[PDB]
Amino acid sequence: VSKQHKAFLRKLYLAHLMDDARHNLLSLGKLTGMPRRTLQDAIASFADIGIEVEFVQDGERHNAGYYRIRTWGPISSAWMDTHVDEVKSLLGVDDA
Template identity: 35%
Template sequence: MTLIPTKTKTSYYRRLYIAYLIDTGVSTVPQIMLETGMPRRTIQDTIKSLSEIDIICVFIGATKDGHYEITHWGAINQKWITNNLQHIITVL
């Protein structure tokens, strides 16, 4: 029996994955699109929603040549994300 992940779980994992990518240098929307295959709007909406789980993400630089940075992870354990990255990707 295969469990289908809930929308809540996929939304949470999407946030963790995008925050992880930003923190590891894949820090622009076009780069994240190439890495994940996600649509631009999904990525933009996900970045905006990171603060809902206490991940602070800021945009650095000008509109055309700037990038995102994670400045605070809140209660999220970055090591857990790294250790479970393949599972996160599989769920998504």
């Protein structure tokens, strides 16, 4: 699997984590082992594959916030549900 296909599966994997649980850079960091840098670039590049992401805070604007997938666009969120396990290793994801 190529550096671009790796990079691609990464985005779909992060998108998947963000879809089933409220996560921010810190939580994604503790869950995936990826450093803040990688996570931000990954997030910053979601638009390049049609995934629109929002960053949401509580009304009083005192919490650390979470990411929300506004739309998956051309990406099938179903597909990722089926191949979570394959992608897990192919990317080398770690944990607390």
